[PDB]
């Protein structure tokens, strides 16, 4: 898990999407300091094993001067960069031309644009179209469109209104994780259910990807669900990436999760009649929804401690 790293630059956003896992908005104040982020980026650029550095938010193009400065710190080290954005900056074709020129010159290998019925009140369809159309001039930047959907807001008209600008662009529609604004602003019956507490053989985490988050903590993946858990990899303010990687690889809970899957934790809760007490829902839109419900409090994580200690003694 030491070839990729991500930094969440800010919780601030121009949009206020009703599903947002971070409840991002123009008035969000959670963020690491700029100088601290410059130090993280410099360290990641100098690191010999990191190949990709990804930026997310919040909206990373909101303070473009700062994003460009960070990409310029990485440039002499030739690391690959990925960006994700709501594409608000697409409104002006001249701006789109400037940003694609910079992304091309700064080794940005992927740009993901999010557009759907939740983002639509904040960004015009023309802005998204301008970005997607201009991307054809930069075939080495992998362009994708992310569409967050619910049963009542499936983004069918959104895709039709993008017209031919989406031709050649990989589109993925995905359901909601019940975190952040999605917990209170979306009816739970409108969130698709694909998994249940019974299909335990398909309950496996897809893998870890280190994220240095805007709350100043470090998380083992970039799923919306993880940020409401108490699973953090930070032990001190000035912690190296070597130490973050070592902690991830020696975390007993994450080791058991990787090796045994969610059924190991779910069976303990079932045998001890803790499913209702810990508010574990019966159905979920994603395996991450199971993850988030198991570990979103210190009580829940600490409940598993004697079981994980017994697992360590029997297998190590």
């Amino acid at each position: 898990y030491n070839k990729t790293v991500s930094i969440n630059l800010d919780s601030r956003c121009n949009a206020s999407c009703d599903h947002c896992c971070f409840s991002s908005s123009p008035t969000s104040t959670t963020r690491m300091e700029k100088e601290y982020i410059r130090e993280l980026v410099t360290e990641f650029a100098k690191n010999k094993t990191i190949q990709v550095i990804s930026f997310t938010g919040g909206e990373v193009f909101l303070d473009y001067k700062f994003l460009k400065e960070l990409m310029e710190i990485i440039k002499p080290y030739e690391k690959q960069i990925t960006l994700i954005s709501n594409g608000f900056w697409g409104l002006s074709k001249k701006k789109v031309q400037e940003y694609f020129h910079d992304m091309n010159s700064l080794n940005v290998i992927a740009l993901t644009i999010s557009y759907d019925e939740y983002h639509a009140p904040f960004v015009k369809s023309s802005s998204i179209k301008n970005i997607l159309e201009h991307s054809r001039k930069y075939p080495d930047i992998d362009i994708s469109l992310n569409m967050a959907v619910t049963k009542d807001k499936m983004s069918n008209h959104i895709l039709e209104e993008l017209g031919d600008s989406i031709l050649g662009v990989k589109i993925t529609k995905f359901p909601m994780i019940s975190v952040g604004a999605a917990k209170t602003r979306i009816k739970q019956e409108n969130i698709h259910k694909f998994y249940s507490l019974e299909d335990e053989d398909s309950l496996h985490c897809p893998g870890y990807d280190i994220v240095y988050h805007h709350d100043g903590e470090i998380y083992p993946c970039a799923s919306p669900a993880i940020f409401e858990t108490k699973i953090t990899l930070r032990e001190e303010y000035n912690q190296s990436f070597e130490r973050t990687v070592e902690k991830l690889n020696s975390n007993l809970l994450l080791f058991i999760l990787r090796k045994e899957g969610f059924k190991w934790f779910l069976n303990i809760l079932k045998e001890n009649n803790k499913i209702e007490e810990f508010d574990i829902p019966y159905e979920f839109s994603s395996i991450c929804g199971v993850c988030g419900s198991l570990f979103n409090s210190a009580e829940k994580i600490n409940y598993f401690y004697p079981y994980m200690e017994k697992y360590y003694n029997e297998n190590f």
């Binding site: 990804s54 993901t112 994780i177 893998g207 870890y208 990807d209 970039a222 799923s223 991450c288």
Partner: peptide
């Protein structure tokens, strides 16, 4: 979006 561990990236 492809695998959940890189969902917001």
């Amino acid at each position: 979006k492809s695998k959940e561990n890189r969902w917001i990236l």
